[PDB]
Amino acid sequence: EVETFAFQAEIAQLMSLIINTFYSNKEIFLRELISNSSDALDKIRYESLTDPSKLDSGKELHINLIPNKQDRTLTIVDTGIGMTKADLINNLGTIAKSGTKAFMEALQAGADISMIGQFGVGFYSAYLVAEKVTVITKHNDDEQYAWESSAGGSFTVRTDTGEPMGRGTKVILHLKEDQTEYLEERRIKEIVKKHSQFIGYPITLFVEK
Numbered sequence: 001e002v003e004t005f006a007f008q009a010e011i012a013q014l015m016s017l018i019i020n021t022f023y024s025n026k027e028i029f030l031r032e033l034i035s036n037s038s039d040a041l042d043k044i045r046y047e048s049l050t051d052p053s054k055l056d057s058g059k060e061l062h063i064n065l066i067p068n069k070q071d072r073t074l075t076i077v078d079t080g081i082g083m084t085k086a087d088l089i090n091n092l093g094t095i096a097k098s099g100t101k102a103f104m105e106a107l108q109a110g111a112d113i114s115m116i117g118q119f120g121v122g123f124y125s126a127y128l129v130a131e132k133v134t135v136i137t138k139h140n141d142d143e144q145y146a147w148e149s150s151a152g153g154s155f156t157v158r159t160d161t162g163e164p165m166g167r168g169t170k171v172i173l174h175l176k177e178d179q180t181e182y183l184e185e186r187r188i189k190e191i192v193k194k195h196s197q198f199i200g201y202p203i204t205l206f207v208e209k
């Protein structure tokens with residue numbers, strides 16, 4: 001049972017701008033998603049400070065980067081707070097309408113796409129390198145859900161019957177054909193060292209073969 005939703009017009013506009021603007025510095029997508037994961041881990045850690053049972057769904061707080069050349073996917077896994085179904089529909093827990101408004105005014109005022117995270121909508125930088133993004137998520141207060149969008153103005157949400165997650169979020173990037181450099185170990189390592197060297201959670205780059 002799959003539900004299909006229309007993006008708010010402003011988010012569809014952000015999404016087409018990310019897809020269509022000529023902008024070579026695409027690697028910042030990874031910094032933005034890792035920072036989102038770090039924010040989500042911060043939230044569940046804070047909740048656990050007064051309620052340790054919040055970690056019954058998993059005590060480890062970490063970020064995994066999983067490239068798969070056969071599927072042409074890069075997956076960013078975290079064990080953060082996750083999101084509810086309501087969160088997923090509400091622009092993946094962001095204030096994306098007002099964030100997009102501020103971002104695009106900054107862009108016409110000299111800013112560039114790499115500054116997207118300063119406006120709270122860094123997630124959508126995924127579409128710099130991904131033709132499709134799948135988000136699997138499990139929040140302590142809800143069931144496991146899968147969000148998916150290939151842009152084009154719509155996204156789907158369904159209950160996820162896939163592998164149980166315990167708690168956290170999985171962002172699966174179905175990479176564009178010419179963006180497979182982000183599946184190579186040395187390229188991912190370089191980006192993590194350049195842009196994510198002070199993230200306060202272990203980042204494990206999985207290897208293949």
Ligand SMILES: Cc1ccc(C(N)=O)cc1N
Binds near residue numbers: 036040080083123169
């Ligand atoms: C926008 C956004 C915010 C937080 C997370 C997460 N890692 O829980 C994922 C996304 N996509």
